[PDB]
Nucleic acid binder design. Structure first.
Ligand SMILES: Nc1ccn([C@@H]2O[C@H](COP(=O)(O)OP(=O)(O)OP(=O)(O)O)[C@@H](O)[C@H]2O)c(=O)n1
Lengths: 65, 47, 125
RNA sequence: AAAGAGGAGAGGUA
């Protein structure tokens, strides 16, 4: 695939750096992943080939732009 | 994550110099570049 | 105590397993019944005091074995386990079943060296 | 539907 784990590591590091607490951002990521999984499970099929946690990391890093 | 160029170390490299380099890399670039730098150094030393 | 915390166990083919709380409870019950029967028929008051003393010793052994006098010994010369021996030390309830536990979804195996790996990767059989 | 219960000794490996 075009998405390697190195990019996810850099994105996670960037998410950690631009915040005041690591525990708070961990909780936010967990909440977003749960919401995304529930949305997937009740409608359509979506690009299921990515875990919800990775999806949440990707959207949260893209929102930084 | 950028804007700092490495110095040319024209000397013999023992463990202390490697530790100094690792500390410098962590202090200037972050925790994601240090892993790749350590991996590259390990591969070169093994080779 | 409830009976499911002191199980009887049905191994041995024809015999049964040994539990230590049941022996102490049985001794207490036996002494109590003997004392009650002796008191009923108006026995001389030099035999009743003996039964009272043995009942006190039996209750003491049930609560905490060896704290005051002699220790109750089972088949072999090995002291029995009282109620206070279940919560006391390194093998007691607190330090064995509450601060540490066994878990599901776990494995164990020997480790070898894998080069050409990344620092965040591992190899699983 | 079913299926192991504890205890005590002796000897080993990180
Ligand atoms: N009573 C013991 C004995 C060993 N260990 C563990 O096992 C290791 C022993 O490693 P070993 O391979 O026996 O020796 P090393 O000191 O590593 O030396 P070498 O491998 O070079 O022989 C200890 O460091 C420790 O982690 C322990 O915890 N308790």
């Amino acid at each position: 695939f075009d998405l390697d784990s190195q990019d996810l590591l850099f994105k996670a590091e960037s998410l950690i750096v631009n915040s005041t607490n690591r525990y708070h951002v961990t909780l936010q990521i967990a909440r977003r992943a749960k919401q995304a999984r529930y949305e997937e499970m009740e409608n359509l099929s979506e690009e299921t080939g990515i875990k919800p946690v990775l999806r949440a990391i990707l959207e949260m890093s893209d929102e930084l732009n | 994550e950028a804007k700092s160029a490495p110095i040319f170390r024209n000397r013999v490299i023992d463990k202390k110099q490697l530790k100094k380099l690792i500390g410098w890399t962590f202090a200037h670039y972050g925790t994601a570049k240090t892993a790749v730098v350590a991996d590259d150094l390990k591969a070169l030393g093994f080779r | 105590i409830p009976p499911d915390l002191r199980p009887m166990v049905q191994l041995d083919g024809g015999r049964f397993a040994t539990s230590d709380l049941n022996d102490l409870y049985r001794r207490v019950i036996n002494r109590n019944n003997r004392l009650a029967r002796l008191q009923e028929i108006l026995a001389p008051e030099i035999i009743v005091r003996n039964e009272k003393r043995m009942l006190q010793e039996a209750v003491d052994a049930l609560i905490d074995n060896g704290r005051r006098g002699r220790t109750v010994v089972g088949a072999n010369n090995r002291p029995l386990k009282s109620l206070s021996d279940i919560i006391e030390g390194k093998q007691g309830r607190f330090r064995q079943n509450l601060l540490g536990k066994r878990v599901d979804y776990s494995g164990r195996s020997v480790i070898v060296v894998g080069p050409n790996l990344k620092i965040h990767q591992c190899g699983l059989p």
